[PDB]
């Protein structure tokens, strides 16, 4: 049996353990990122598995540096561990080189860590995909996505999780290059409400964060009142 170890190729040159980890991401609820003129916005479909949980709990949006947000899908303990790696990488960068780590470089570094877990019988691949977003005057808005294989690319728009494709097709309708973060939040909320399967899994919380000119390059949760208006816009647009 050829699918038991990341140190074994199948006879067609696949590494099935990495594909199986990808499957864990594709079973997760959907997260999206959108880059626009003046920043990056994140949204997550947060499925509510019990009414006993606090509204807030199981965050899937993290600060990995003051200027960098992380949005995750898949196995959450793996994702949280990856957020700690990312944090350590940004922290060490600042200590050694003296300035905020460039998003692209952070993405490349964390991606190579993810990649190292796809070569060996000794460890398994991470069961998570994640997006990283930032903004600065010099570098502009940046949005990267890393998968369990360790491949990293930059995006205008991105979706991960089970309604990935449905989300992409809605994201393609936006002229995001020309829009602002304050506009894009409403659309992120809208797209999450479209791809949510309200018949199969019942109740959900929307989680929103952003980083842009309007936060002075700091990654921050979207304020309560703005989220609620974006929800209201999304709900009524569904109609």
């Amino acid at each position: 049996g050829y699918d038991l170890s990341a140190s074994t190729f199948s006879p067609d040159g696949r590494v099935f353990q990495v594909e199986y980890a990808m499957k864990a991401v594709e079973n997760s609820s959907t997260a999206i990122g959108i880059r626009c003129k003046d920043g990056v916005v994140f949204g997550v479909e947060k499925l509510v598995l019990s009414k006993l949980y606090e509204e807030g709990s199981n965050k899937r949006l993290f600060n990995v540096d003051r200027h960098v947000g992380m949005a995750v899908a898949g196995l959450l303990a793996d994702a949280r561990s990856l957020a700690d790696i990312a944090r350590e990488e940004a922290s060490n960068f600042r200590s050694n080189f003296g300035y905020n780590i460039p998003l692209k470089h952070l993405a490349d570094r964390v991606a190579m860590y993810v990649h190292a877990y796809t070569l060996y019988s000794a460890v398994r691949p991470f069961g998570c995909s994640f997006m990283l977003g930032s903004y600065s005057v010099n570098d502009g808005a940046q949005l990267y996505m890393i998968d369990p294989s360790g491949v990293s690319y930059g995006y205008w728009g991105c979706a991960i999780g089970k309604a990935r494709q449905a989300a992409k097709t809605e994201i393609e309708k936006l002229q995001m290059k020309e829009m602002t973060c304050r506009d894009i939040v409403k659309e992120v909320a809208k797209i999450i409400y479209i791809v949510h399967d309200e018949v199969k899994d019942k109740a959900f919380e929307l989680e929103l964060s952003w980083v842009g000119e309007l936060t002075n390059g700091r990654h921050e949760i979207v304020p309560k009142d703005i989220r609620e208006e974006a929800e209201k816009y999304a709900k009524e647009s569904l109609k």
């Binding site: 190729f9 696949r14 590494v15 490349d108 990267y144 491949v151 690319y153």
Partner: protein, 244 residues
């Protein structure tokens, strides 16, 4: 014998009864999973790498989709195969070159860098606990005595220098095209090196490219720094090919 198997000879890098390493052979199949082909040619004056640039998704930042990599200022590289494996091999190459320079006080030769990467890959063919990298590396640079250089190494730890070569899905077809084109040429060398490379790629895929569907990297005797052509520079070569 002929496809025979005993024990774990299809799961780890131990010998089969013919003396084969199935896991290495499967690493070569992994190169093709990416769906791309790359070509590289050398002339007296320059060396060039051309590869397919496939951006299906309108939502990718296409500036970040590349298989061309600077190793040092003077050494360029094209990667074919599994992407994250490739990145890892690029990092290692950069690390080896920087290291060489620090210890010995001169730039690593292209042949030595290729050999070093091939020697590292060989280790994964002999030690059971890790798989080979499912990728192939082609390196270009100017050597002070020998002129422009193209080198390639693979997941078996073989490496070689070339007059021209290729990697990926259409490697054999590209090899054939390049062979028939060199036999014609007196002193067995190419001249119009960028055009040959693109034309090889265009034929074996049957595409006729837009400037945004390929990437091109060059080193020249007069300008040895590795350079990546812009869309416009690429377009000029595409337009110049069309007009005969």
């Amino acid at each position: 014998s002929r496809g025979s198997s005993a024990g774990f000879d299809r799961h780890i890098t131990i010998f089969s009864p013919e003396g084969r390493l199935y896991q290495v052979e499967y690493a070569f199949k992994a190169i093709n999973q990416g769906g791309l082909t790359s070509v590289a040619v050398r002339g007296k004056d320059c060396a060039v790498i051309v590869t397919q640039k496939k951006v299906p998704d309108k939502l990718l930042d296409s500036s970040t989709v590349t298989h061309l990599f600077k190793i040092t200022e003077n050494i360029g590289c094209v990667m074919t195969g599994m992407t994250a494996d490739s990145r890892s091999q690029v990092q290692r190459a950069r690390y080896e070159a920087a290291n060489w320079k620090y210890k010995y006080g001169y730039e690593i030769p292209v042949d030595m860098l290729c050999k070093r990467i091939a020697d590292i890959s060989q280790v994964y063919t002999q030690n059971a606990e890790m798989r080979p990298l499912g990728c192939c590396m082609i390196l270009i640079g100017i050597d002070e005595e020998q002129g422009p250089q193209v080198y390639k190494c693979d997941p078996a730890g073989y490496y070689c220098g070339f007059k021209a070569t290729a990697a990926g899905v259409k490697q054999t077809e590209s090899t054939s095209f390049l062979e028939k084109k060199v036999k014609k040429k007196f002193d067995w060398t190419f001249e119009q090196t960028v055009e040959t490379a693109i034309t090889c790629l265009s034929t074996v895929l049957s595409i006729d490219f837009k400037p945004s569907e390929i990437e091109v990297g060059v080193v020249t005797v007069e300008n040895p720094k590795f350079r990546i052509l812009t869309e416009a520079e690429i377009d000029a070569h595409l337009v110049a090919l069309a007009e005969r």
